[PDB]
Design a protein around this ligand. Structure first.
Ligand SMILES: COc1cc2nc(N3CCOCC3)nc(NC3CCN(C)CC3)c2cc1OC
Ligand SMILES: COc1cc2nc(N3CCOCC3)nc(NC3CCN(C)CC3)c2cc1OC
Ligand SMILES: C[S@@+](CC[C@H](N)C(=O)[O-])C[C@H]1O[C@@H](n2cnc3c(N)ncnc32)[C@H](O)[C@@H]1O
Ligand SMILES: C[S@@+](CC[C@H](N)C(=O)[O-])C[C@H]1O[C@@H](n2cnc3c(N)ncnc32)[C@H](O)[C@@H]1O
Ligand SMILES: [Zn+2]
Ligand SMILES: [Zn+2]
Ligand SMILES: [Zn+2]
Ligand SMILES: [Zn+2]
Ligand SMILES: [Zn+2]
Ligand SMILES: [Zn+2]
Ligand SMILES: [Zn+2]
Ligand SMILES: [Zn+2]
Lengths: 259, 257
């Protein structure tokens, strides 16, 4: 039987609750971490927050025209009127997305604002049969929809190199390299399992700052995700080059690349 | 006749619009600054944001008990269920307020969260007869209500010392200032009053770096619909500006006329 072990692992910090259920075993709701809805630091990260360093737009409309400077930075604004990625968006090789910010002349409800509006999809933490906890959608999610951000503790590469527990790390590549470590502090994304044919793709996004060492990681759906479906993203080759020595992929794809 | 010269000076960044009207002269809506709804910086302020440095509570309820650490840091939680300051709150000499934060065990709707939820009151930028632009409340505001935050550019005292325009400065007692001259929210337009209906309170939310309190204005009394907002700019302002002009707040108890 399916036990509800939390009505909201986010304790009201997201726009929607994210409940946790367990229909597999007697494991209680995960508690060996702290849920945070936004990135945090321990050691200082000198993120450039000088407001005069932001590039911004001077649009007089809703930023849906060809002329939006923020769109231009992104190659073009990739968001349609519903906040979804255009069909032309390259899922195999995503551009950097620069959303509008507080220095722009446009209004807070302009078109070029999606990730900064936060998590909206109805998600659920659940106990899988064979790879611990995972995350599923409770609803249909159309292609190109923002699902969630990979949130955690921003750390340097040298700090990551002395952290024994590296199973919750996302690399932010650049010669100055940083990571998000979601082991001790993280949001719902820390529970998303690896899939070799993933229904999510991580996109580098800039909002309140444009410090290129610290993109934020926004997962968008790569296809229609049907209600009940487990979320997955491709953890990438560094992960598997390390953990492949310890276990093989159980994503079960007929095209699995790490089995 | 009362001309609407902006439907919202905040351009959608507050919960509700903050229109600007002018029934006095031909001045357009102020435009020589950038509206921001949260504090910003130019030069880096090394604010301590180490999450393990936060003090936090382990409450399993709605933080209405005296066991709440954040309440104890505040001396007690000063908020009733409506987010208003209790009658016993010392308006003449306010304590620091530590609101709950993201390190606390409690929920995002606990009792000890008010300023972090942002501006709610219906305000209006308007042209006064005697002292330029001012801010009024469009509705009744009960005593002890959070009205708005003094928002602007965080700068050092030494940076403040080399800025020409010091008329939009709020001292955070090495010391720091909020300068709302170039970047600021609606609070930059609030005029001085010697018997003020607002009091500034130092509040801590996402960080507890005591060098950088955030400045929250709370009502000191019932503010009736249509009333101009005012706070006491303090002695340093008037020590300087009193050489140039006198206070026109019009109070029978005016201390700077
Ligand atoms: C995306 O998945 C992973 C990324 C990882 N990234 C790093 N660094 C970033 C580059 O710069 C060196 C660090 N280190 C790991 N592991 C280190 C290797 C060295 N070890 C002593 C500590 C843990 C990772 C592991 C990952 O998954 C298993
Ligand atoms: C609360 O209102 C004010 C605060 C002010 N604070 C400072 N500081 C200087 C550095 O230590 C303390 C904060 N300077 C001001 N004025 C100037 C800055 C320009 N300087 C040429 C002369 C002193 C101020 C002025 C104020 O209103 C007029
Ligand atoms: C970020 S976590 C995902 C959440 C994890 N299932 C849990 O219960 O905490 C990464 C770990 O989950 C397991 N995992 C995720 N995807 C997997 C996969 N495709 N095959 C095998 N194990 C996987 C591995 O132990 C991996 O180190
Ligand atoms: C922070 S601003 C307030 C907004 C200002 N009225 C405007 O039009 O931008 C401070 C300035 O407003 C004027 N002011 C504010 N309160 C005043 C008062 N009580 N008496 C006279 N002038 C005042 C003074 O010129 C003061 O330097
Ligand atoms: Zn634009
Ligand atoms: Zn825009
Ligand atoms: Zn823009
Ligand atoms: Zn696989
Ligand atoms: Zn508490
Ligand atoms: Zn607390
Ligand atoms: Zn609380
Ligand atoms: Zn006066």
């Amino acid at each position: 039987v399916e036990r509800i072990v939390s009505r909201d692992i986010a304790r009201g910090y997201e726009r929607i609750p994210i409940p946790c259920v367990n229909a597999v075993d007697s494991e209680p709701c995960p508690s060996n971490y702290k849920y945070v809805s936004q990135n945090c630091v321990t050691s200082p990260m000198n993120i450039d927050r000088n407001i005069t360093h932001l590039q911004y737009c001077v649009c007089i409309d809703d930023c849906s025209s060809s002329n939006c400077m923020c769109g231009q930075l992104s190659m073009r604004c990739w968001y349609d009127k519903d906040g979804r990625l255009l069909p032309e968006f390259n899922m195999a090789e995503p551009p950097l997305i620069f959303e509008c910010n507080h220095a722009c002349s446009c209004w807070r409800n302009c078109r070029n604002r999606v990730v900064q509006n936060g998590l909206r999809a109805r998600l659920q933490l659940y106990r899988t049969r064979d790879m611990g906890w995972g995350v599923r959608s409770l609803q249909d999610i159309p292609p190109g929809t923002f699902v969630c951000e990979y949130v955690g503790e921003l750390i340097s590469d040298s700090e990551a190199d002395v952290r024994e527990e590296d199973s919750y790390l996302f690399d932010l590549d650049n010669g100055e390299v940083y990571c998000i470590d979601a082991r001790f502090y993280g949001n719902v994304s820390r529970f998303i399992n690896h899939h070799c044919e993933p229904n999510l793709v991580p996109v580098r996004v800039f909002m309140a700052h444009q410090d290129l060492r610290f993109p934020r990681i926004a997962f968008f759906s790569t296809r229609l995700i049907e209600a009940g479906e487990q979320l997955g993203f491709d953890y990438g080759e560094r992960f598997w080059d390390i953990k492949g020595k310890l276990f093989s992929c159980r994503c079960g794809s007929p095209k699995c690349r790490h089995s």
